[PDB]
């Protein structure tokens, strides 16, 4: 449901290429004219071939066609809606009622579900259906799995925000180490689990586990094509730095951690810096 042909036409004309330059050795003229008219659907193979002809990135072409936004399908709208609800909680009840029963349909809805649970937990909104199902839910979703997808790592990231570590860890362990990258998004979620779990393991003083997460993150850095998140790399190093302060009791590490956190302020990540300073204080107790 995207006007890819129009974008091909748009780029073609912008680069002063003639229709010929594109369709020749691929399809007939009349057919190609149908592509740019957006009357005939285009194959992935076809679009890949046209992306070569123009010299403009295949994925960029897609984004320009309308894949860059999330509102492309039901799921995305619902994920954008989480923000609305987080800020405007009075709209919780109405929506959670529509989401809750759909939670086991796709891994995407389940992600959303955990999102609502986090909103609820934050505002002390009663969610009795949660405590009564999560276990059977996760047992349903994961007991028979072998490989894991970006959405899975997303789920687990969020799962950690709403279940005690001791319940989630059994699911995390099979999902690592990572061996390959499957996009900037896959990259993001595989890192978030790490970052989230490292945070919790530190908070709770499970130093053993905490190191596991640090090491896992370091391994990511060795994967070819992996797109490490700059701000993640900083936050995790601060956590790593606090880990070294807790194990070796050497004060230099603490300073480093602080020095890292402040860098966030110095680069204008105001709210993230505030979040981190609260967390540091927190760490230095329970």
């Amino acid at each position: 449901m995207f006007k890819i042909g129009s974008v091909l036409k748009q780029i073609r004309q912008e680069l002063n290429y003639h229709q010929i330059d594109l369709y020749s050795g691929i399809m007939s003229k009349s057919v190609y004219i149908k592509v740019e008219a957006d009357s005939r659907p285009i194959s992935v193979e076809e679009l890949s071939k046209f992306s070569e002809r123009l010299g403009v990135n295949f994925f960029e072409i897609l984004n320009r066609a309308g894949m860059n936004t999330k509102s492309v399908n039901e799921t995305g709208k619902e994920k954008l809606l989480i923000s609305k609800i987080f800020t405007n909680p009075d709209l919780f009840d109405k929506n959670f009622q529509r989401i809750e029963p759909k939670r086991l349909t796709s891994l995407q809805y389940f992600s959303i579900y955990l999102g609502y649970i986090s909103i609820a937990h934050h505002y002390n909104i009663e969610v009795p259906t949660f405590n009564k199902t999560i276990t059977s839910d996760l047992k349903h979703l994961y007991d028979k799995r072998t490989t894991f997808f970006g959405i899975d790592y997303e789920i687990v990231s969020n799962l950690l925000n709403v279940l005690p570590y001791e319940e989630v860890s059994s699911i995390i362990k099979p999902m690592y180490p990572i061996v390959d990258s499957f996009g900037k998004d896959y990259d993001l979620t595989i890192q978030t689990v790490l970052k989230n779990a490292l945070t919790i393991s530190i908070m709770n003083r499970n130093l053993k586990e905490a190191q596991y997460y640090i090491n896992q993150f370091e391994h990511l850095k060795t994967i070819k094509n992996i797109s490490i998140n700059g701000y993640y790399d900083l936050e995790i190093n601060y956590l790593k730095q606090i880990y070294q302060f807790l194990t070796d009791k050497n004060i230099d590490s603490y300073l480093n951690a602080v020095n890292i956190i402040n860098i966030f302020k110095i680069i204008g990540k105001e709210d993230i810096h505030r979040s981190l300073v609260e967390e540091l204080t927190k760490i230095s107790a329970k």
Partner: peptide, 7 residues
Amino acid sequence: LVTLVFV
């Protein structure tokens, strides 16, 4: 920090 993520 424990962050939520929605792709």
